Write a protein that binds this ligand. Sequence first.
Ligand code: ZA4
Ligand code: ZA4
Ligand code: CL
Ligand code: CL
Ligand code: CL
Ligand code: CL
Ligand code: CL
Ligand code: CL
Ligand code: CL
Ligand code: CL
Ligand code: CL
Ligand code: CL
Ligand code: CL
Ligand code: CL
Ligand code: CL
Ligand code: CL
Ligand code: CL
Ligand code: CL
Ligand code: CL
Ligand code: CL
Ligand code: CL
Ligand code: CL
Ligand code: CL
Ligand code: CL
Ligand code: CL
Ligand code: CL
Ligand code: CL
Ligand code: CL
Ligand code: CL
Ligand code: CL
Ligand code: CL
Ligand code: NA
Ligand code: NA
Lengths: 470, 470
Amino acid sequence: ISEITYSDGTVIASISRDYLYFTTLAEAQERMYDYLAQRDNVSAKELKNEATQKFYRDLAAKEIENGGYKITTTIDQKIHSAMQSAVADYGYLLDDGTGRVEVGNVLMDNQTGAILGFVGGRNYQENQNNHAFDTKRSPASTTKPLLAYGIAIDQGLMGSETILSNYPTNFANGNPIMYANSKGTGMMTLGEALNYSWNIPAYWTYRMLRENGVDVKGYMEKMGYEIPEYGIESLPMGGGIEVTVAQHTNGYQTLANNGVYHQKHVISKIEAADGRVVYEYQDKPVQVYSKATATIMQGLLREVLSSRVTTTFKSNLTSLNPTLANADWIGKTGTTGQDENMWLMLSTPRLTLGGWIGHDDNHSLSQQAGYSNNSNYMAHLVNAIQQASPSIWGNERFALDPSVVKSEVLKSTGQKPGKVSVEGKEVEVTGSTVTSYWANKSGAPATSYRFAIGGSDADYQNAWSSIVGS
Amino acid sequence: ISEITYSDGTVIASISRDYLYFTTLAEAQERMYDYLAQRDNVSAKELKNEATQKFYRDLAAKEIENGGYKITTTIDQKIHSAMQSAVADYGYLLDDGTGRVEVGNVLMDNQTGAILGFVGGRNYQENQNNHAFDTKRSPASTTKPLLAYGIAIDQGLMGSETILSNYPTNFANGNPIMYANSKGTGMMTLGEALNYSWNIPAYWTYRMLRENGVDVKGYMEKMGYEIPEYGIESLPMGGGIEVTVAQHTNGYQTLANNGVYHQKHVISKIEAADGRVVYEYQDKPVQVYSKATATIMQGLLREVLSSRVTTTFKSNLTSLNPTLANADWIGKTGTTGQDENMWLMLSTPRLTLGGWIGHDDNHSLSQQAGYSNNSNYMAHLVNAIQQASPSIWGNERFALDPSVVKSEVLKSTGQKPGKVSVEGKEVEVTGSTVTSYWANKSGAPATSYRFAIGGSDADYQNAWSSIVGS
Ligand SMILES: *[B-](O)(O)CNC(=O)c1ccccc1F
Ligand SMILES: *[B-](O)(O)CNC(=O)c1ccccc1F
Ligand SMILES: [Cl-]
Ligand SMILES: [Cl-]
Ligand SMILES: [Cl-]
Ligand SMILES: [Cl-]
Ligand SMILES: [Cl-]
Ligand SMILES: [Cl-]
Ligand SMILES: [Cl-]
Ligand SMILES: [Cl-]
Ligand SMILES: [Cl-]
Ligand SMILES: [Cl-]
Ligand SMILES: [Cl-]
Ligand SMILES: [Cl-]
Ligand SMILES: [Cl-]
Ligand SMILES: [Cl-]
Ligand SMILES: [Cl-]
Ligand SMILES: [Cl-]
Ligand SMILES: [Cl-]
Ligand SMILES: [Cl-]
Ligand SMILES: [Cl-]
Ligand SMILES: [Cl-]
Ligand SMILES: [Cl-]
Ligand SMILES: [Cl-]
Ligand SMILES: [Cl-]
Ligand SMILES: [Cl-]
Ligand SMILES: [Cl-]
Ligand SMILES: [Cl-]
Ligand SMILES: [Cl-]
Ligand SMILES: [Cl-]
Ligand SMILES: [Cl-]
Ligand code: NA
Ligand code: NA
């Protein structure tokens, strides 16, 4: 008899009808597949043969059923059981009058990529689809910190108080870029853009990446994302991307871990009965963002939750467990265009918890499913995890890395005071200031007419008119 | 006294208040600018200095006003005067109850790029903007033969009877790709896609280009197009592109000239009074599409006009001048998303005539402005040109190049008959056939499940079900 164990060696099952069983069994079979093919001296070319593959996949499965293998998972028993009890008891809080609402969650150790526990859905016995590991959906606006703002900062094209355009603009096809139901507003800081999750600032950020020839794909593929096509205007908002919850948690793990990626995993080791090691996880840490970038983003994502603009989570949690709400939470929400998918990604320095909700057939949720329902549900979920394992979230604070550069900039331009040109009149650019955080060598530039990320000529004439106004 | 002359040496003016004057004067000043900078030994670096530039631009202008230069244009006097009389007399036919409708046209010699005449607008005295040379607008669906279908054919990814998906699909942001007001239909041939100008087949064609790593930019830049960003889902429909009528005529010149680009020009030579040559046009022909590709596209674009689906032009012309309607006309229309810009591009083997209409402030035209108004106007315009210069359009036929490969293919799959897989059942793929034209070495491939350009799994299950049906 083979067994699957929790991280401490306690047996989960021998080779039983829930997500934990089938998820950890499936991964184990994949590792056994690669092991057996190699053992049998089957090449990459022979492995391409579909008949050969089907044989080796069946071999790997039977090999487990009849062998004496010991499969060590990363799963924490108390934590995972608590997460199942949370979804059983509180999952109904997801139901928003758009029918039954499905859900996936993955809890990940930021320093190892180990998956400590997860939620595959509302109830395996009623619907088996695995929403933590198997289903793939647009990650929506939780794309923005990774693909737009974080890369711009890392490249030194943007600092923490940089200004962006949120003025009306169209896609190349002539359609207005919409956010919720607004065609846009005016200039705004990166923090307001993030807190509100506006679309236009992210569009312009990604265009600025394209114009500077930035290798955005290299960033993403270092985190294990697969995106078929980078030439998409809405990439940074979630367009043209589709991810599992497990994979997306790993992107947020990378930001939370001061920029260092560890590859997600649920199997840590497989041994034969005699102790032969058939598989073992090999850590391959990668510095994906500079420590400066990651720690600047942490600061911004702290205020995404504190501001409470797109999620009630911090209020929900404060009431359930005020001492846990005082841990150093950061996070980002996402909402797709017709309210089909909602995300909330949460981190403390120690753990990252990813969350998605939506419908299996992709029909819309209610306008508030992510702001309120998923926020309140994930608050219960985080409380349940904490109660089951009181120290697991930790009391450490995220903190700016010493390598961060701090510049004094104009609140209005996000750039250092100095002379600028406003047709004719060369002007002394005065007024109240603020510290902006950068991830380059020299920090913020001198103020310059086109001070913002994006903007049309109209936009800048208006902006500078308002500015000059004082 | 300096003068500007027609192509035969007849004086246009000395250095008078219409488009012809200011257009040919402006180009001449640019050529004089480059000449004078070089004469004076001003480097590229010194030329970057904005003060230096302004001086040399003023120098070039005065140099003309006070010198004895002879500026030879490509303009044909009879033809250009006729085009002015046509727009004066018939321009009102553009007015569609969306206010005054502006217009630009450029008539180009396919074998030289010489611009024989043009229409800058409804009336210079009332509105000076030059709509033939200066204003830039999306070319809309006239992008498709150049950037999508023509390049796919040239690369041997597509033949004249290849099948494409027009099933509903969304942009990456989740919005349905719309055409007119339909979310789409089913499979269709390239000819039906072109005749109707559907959007979805062009989207998939361009995606297929991206997936094969095709250097689409190299094609376009060989025709002198400047497109800032190729990573745009709607590129092939006109999104993210903005062109003058003069530049866009030159793309259609390239297709009409069996694939060989000649650079558009309106100045052919400038001489000092003593005969010194200050500037002279240097032909630089480039084979942009293979002769096979260009001649296959000619065949398709013939039927875009003959079918009369998106333009009444051939009917309009048949009535005005039935002997000229029997010349070998090919062409493509374009309409932007809110009916803001309409195009019609027309060629015979000898000439290409580009046409745009729209409003100076970009507000919408009526639903039919391009189908009917601009078609009827351009019919009068072509008749006027012919009457002024009876042989200029020519009686030559476009013809398939001997290098074209012809394959017998299934009407339903656009591919050669053969066995295919339709879950389980391997099937003999029978039924009525047709000759498809290719620009590769081997012609059409054997039929294969994913037979069309684009399509979702749903799409193919449906298609193959219908097919199997017979
Ligand atoms: B964000 O608050 O989820 C806003 N994002 C979107 O509008 C967006 C646009 C395009 C594709 C996906 C998506 F979530
Ligand atoms: B064609 O018949 O003009 C259809 N083209 C369009 O819908 C289109 C899409 C996007 C941008 C421009 C444009 F003309
Ligand atoms: Cl489970
Ligand atoms: Cl499962
Ligand atoms: Cl064996
Ligand atoms: Cl455990
Ligand atoms: Cl990239
Ligand atoms: Cl992915
Ligand atoms: Cl790209
Ligand atoms: Cl794993
Ligand atoms: Cl053993
Ligand atoms: Cl670093
Ligand atoms: Cl708070
Ligand atoms: Cl709240
Ligand atoms: Cl400073
Ligand atoms: Cl300020
Ligand atoms: Cl004129
Ligand atoms: Cl002019
Ligand atoms: Cl001089
Ligand atoms: Cl002449
Ligand atoms: Cl859209
Ligand atoms: Cl390209
Ligand atoms: Cl151009
Ligand atoms: Cl590109
Ligand atoms: Cl010229
Ligand atoms: Cl002289
Ligand atoms: Cl050729
Ligand atoms: Cl006809
Ligand atoms: Cl008709
Ligand atoms: Cl054949
Ligand atoms: Cl057929
Ligand atoms: Na959101
Ligand atoms: Na059209």
